[PDB]
Amino acid sequence: MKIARVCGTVTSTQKEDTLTGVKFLVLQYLGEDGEFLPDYEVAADTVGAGQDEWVLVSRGSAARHIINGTDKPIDAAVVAIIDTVSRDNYLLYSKRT
Amino acid sequence: MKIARVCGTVTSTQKEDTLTGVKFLVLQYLGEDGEFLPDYEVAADTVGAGQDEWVLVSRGSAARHIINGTDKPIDAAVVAIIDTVSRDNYLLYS
Amino acid sequence: MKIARVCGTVTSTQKEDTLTGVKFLVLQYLGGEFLPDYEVAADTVGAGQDEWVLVSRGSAARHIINGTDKPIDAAVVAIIDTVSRDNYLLYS
Amino acid sequence: MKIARVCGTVTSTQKEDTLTGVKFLVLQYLGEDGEFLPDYEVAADTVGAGQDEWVLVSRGSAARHIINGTDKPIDAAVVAIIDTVSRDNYLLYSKR
Amino acid sequence: MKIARVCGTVTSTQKEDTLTGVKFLVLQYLGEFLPDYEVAADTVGAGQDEWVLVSRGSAARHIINGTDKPIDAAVVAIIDTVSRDNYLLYSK
């Protein structure tokens, strides 16, 4: 999985029937030391991730194993909203509780 | 999924038999700050996307889960036509 | 899928019993020009030297005819007649 | 698979209920010459890897075949803690 | 599939139980070699410096008895020959 931040949304009306009701988040990947990387992923979200929150994103067939994702033609999804990130036992990020 | 713009088409007669009737679109991947990369993809379209339109492209086995995609040897598919893209509360595309 | 041209072949006598009969093509990826990355791929469609092909990668490749339960990562799934960008042809 | 080193953790209390109990490790991928890259991956661990330990990480559907991983939406897993890595007759890593 | 050569080995004792017996080879991808490596399961019995086809993703589990093995890379063939644009790039 990869760490990213929620940076936006994608909207559509003309799409695969299987994607009705699917909320599309734009994600910006985060690199070393929280770096805002020039790289993004449109991902489905069934967790409830807010703008600017840090998330874990899974890509490939894993996306289809989110709740109700089985028949969905999606290759990226939010599977967790990050509460904490740490390196060598020291905190570098925390979420608003 | 990636954001991409429809830029062309691919046709073929000599092909795996399961691909009969599958429309192929040439797609161009969106880079950064509204720019499109010199990277392309060829994807199946069961949504009905056209030239210059923006779309969501899903890759891998996801493609086989489009309408009639079962057991087709395709690793890329248009799954949505995009109406709007916001990033950091700025309406990048509409 | 990606666009490529058939540039060569690969042979092996020491291999998974599952790859029996499988022919191995070498593909050179295209960018309207061609490019330095290679893919080794299966083919049943009859793609020959210099022909333009569409290559599908990952589990898709096992969905070619007789591809079931073959440990193959990539396959030619079509030979290309035309490729149009906007209002012109990069290739026919 | 890729070789990587364990260099941290991620925690989440709001997530897919399938992932309950899932230990998340932050991994750092080996580049060349014994030197690690600034590319990172968050992977599930059922092997019990710890800080600074070298590991083999498998990605994609492979990650769901770890013990108990069947229907988990995970695309990266630690599948082995490394004892040695060779590149010839030399020894890029030894746990010892 | 990717052309690589075998440049080393990885051993482990604490690991997923399904991987008992699995030999791990270090590979370096491809007319000469890149800084990019991969570690892969070997059931064909490849050796140091030999060229090989590596298959990645779910393909790796369609090797002999790989069904429930958490592996995403596998040596599926030892290469005897590689040909490119009417010219021979590799053989022994």
UniProtKB/Swiss-Prot annotation, chain C:
Give compartment(s): Carboxysome
Q: Where does this protein chiefly localize? A: other
Alphabetic keyword roster: Bacterial microcompartment, Carbon dioxide fixation, Carboxysome, Photosynthesis
Q: Where would I find the BMV domain in this sequence?
A: 1-81
- What Gene Ontology terms describe where this protein resides (cellular component)? carboxysome
Which GO BP annotation is one of this protein's?
carbon fixation
Database matches in Pfam families: EutN_CcmL
Matching HAMAP family:
CcmL
Oligomer status and interactors? Homopentamer. May interact with CcmK2, this occurs at very high CcmK2 concentrations. Interacts with full-length CcmM.
- Protein's recorded name: Carboxysome shell vertex protein CcmL
